[PDB]
Amino acid sequence: SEIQLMHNLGKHLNSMERVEWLRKKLQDVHNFVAL
Incomplete structure (x- = not known):
């Protein structure tokens, strides 16, 4: 295990740990006016 x-x-x-990852990770940066 x-x-x-x-x-x-x-x-x-x-x-697979990108699409759903970056989805919740978008709340950690919220605005993020960069790259």
């Missing part, structure tokens, strides 16, 4: 069990760090981030 590991590797996939608790994968929030960066190597799991790439395609």
Whole structure:
């Protein structure tokens, strides 16, 4: 029970931990007038 069990760090981030990730991560930056 590991590797996939608790994968929030960066190597799991790439395609599925981006769309739903950046979705909640947009509230952490809210305005964000940059890149």
